[PDB]
Amino acid sequence: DDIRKYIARKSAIKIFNQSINYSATKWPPEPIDKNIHMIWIGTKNISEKNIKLSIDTAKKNPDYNTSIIYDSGISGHEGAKKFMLEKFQDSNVNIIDFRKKSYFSQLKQEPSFAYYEQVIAENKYAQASDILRLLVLKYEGGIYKDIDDIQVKGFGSLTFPKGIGVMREYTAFPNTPIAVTKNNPIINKTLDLAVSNYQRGEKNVLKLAGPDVFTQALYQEIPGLDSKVLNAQLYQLELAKRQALGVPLEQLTSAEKEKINRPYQSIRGLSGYVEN
Numbered sequence: 471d472d473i474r475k476y477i478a479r480k481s482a483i484k485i486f487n488q489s490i491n492y493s494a495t496k497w498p499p500e501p502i503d504k505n506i507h508m509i510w511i512g513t514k515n516i517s518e519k520n521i522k523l524s525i526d527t528a529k530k531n532p533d534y535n536t537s538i539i540y541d542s543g544i545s546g547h548e549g550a551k552k553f554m555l556e557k558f559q560d561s562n563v564n565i566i567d568f569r570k571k572s573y574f575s576q577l578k579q580e581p582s583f584a585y586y587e588q589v590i591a592e593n594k595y596a597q598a599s600d601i602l603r604l605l606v607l608k609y610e611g612g613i614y615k616d617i618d619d620i621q622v623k624g625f626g627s628l629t630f631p632k633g634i635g636v637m638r639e640y641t642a643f644p645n646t647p648i649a650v651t652k653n654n655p656i657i658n659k660t661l662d663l664a665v666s667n668y669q670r671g672e673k674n675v676l677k678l679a680g681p682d683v684f685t686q687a688l689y690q691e692i693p694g695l696d697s698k699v700l701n702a703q704l705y706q707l708e709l710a711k712r713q714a715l716g717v718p719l720e721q722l723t724s725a726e727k728e729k730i731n732r733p734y735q736s737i738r739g740l741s742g743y744v745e746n
């Protein structure tokens with residue numbers, strides 16, 4: 471009888487350790503395409519400050535195609551476009567028209583792009599960029615960066631579990647910078663929520679396609695990014711481990727918790743590359 475309980479416990483703990491060991495690497499990191507996407511749409515000239523930040527962004531990332539996307543479907547955009555072409559001529563920053571993207575014809579099937587056309591028609595360029603950045607990432611992947619952020623250090627070769635890299639939370643994750651694989655479910659979900667928010671006439675611009683919506687998408691697709699969900703998971707494991715050892719219902723070691731946390735900490739690995 472005593473040998474039976476010893477067998478049952480060593481088998482149960484074996485299964486448990488294998489599961490903890492698997493959890494550390496459960497989502498193999500996926501390479502991010504080496505494109506940096508920045509947005510400057512509208513009719514106003516880019517500021518000399520942001521020209522300098524953008525060139526610095528390109529210099530600290532010589533292994534990347536760095537681009538600023540404008541939109542020729544915006545009335546009166548021509549001046550701003552010309553100014554940029556001349557200011558970035560002597561740099562490795564590429565100035566490109568969204569309308570000339572190879573995938574542009576496919577956007578006629580996107581309800582989110584119908585909303586984007588409404589937003590730019592009201593000259594709401596900052597609000598528009600919340601939708602535009604998701605569309606670019608959906609179709610191309612790569613890294614989206616804010617035009618006015620300082621590049622602290624080069625991105626390098628990035629790989630991320632579930633093909634998504636974000637900056638740690640402020641409770642919300644910022645919607646910049648974002649590193650993602652193309653056609654990523656997190657980006658598609660954010661756009662889906664955004665269509666819903668525009669349809670119902672959400673008036674808070676941040677709750678249309680902002681960090682709070684990006685956050686909801688992250689939590690739905692990867693629940694363990696939410697500390698409350700991850701905490702409930704750890705308590706479940708703590709209880710499962712004592713059940714395995716047949717001890718009354720703290721057993722989780724710091725090693726085991728490091729492994730459980732590893733993919734979710736790795737997703738937050740886009741922290742520290744861009745500032746201000």
Ligand SMILES: CC(=O)N[C@H]1[C@@H](OP(=O)(O)OP(=O)(O)OC[C@H]2O[C@@H](n3ccc(=O)[nH]c3=O)[C@H](O)[C@@H]2O)O[C@H](CO)[C@@H](O)[C@@H]1O
Nearest residue numbers: 509510511512514595596597599600616617618645680681
């Ligand atoms: C902490 C926080 O809540 N920040 C939000 C805030 O940032 P914030 O208020 O800093 O937004 P910005 O004014 O920088 O504009 C966002 C982006 O819009 C683009 N732009 C802006 C003006 C323009 O004429 N042309 C143009 O292309 C630029 O790429 C710019 O980087 O509002 C943004 C737009 O809703 C959201 O993305 C941010 O998450």
Ligand SMILES: [Ca+2]
Nearest residue numbers: 616617618619
């Ligand atoms: Ca900004």
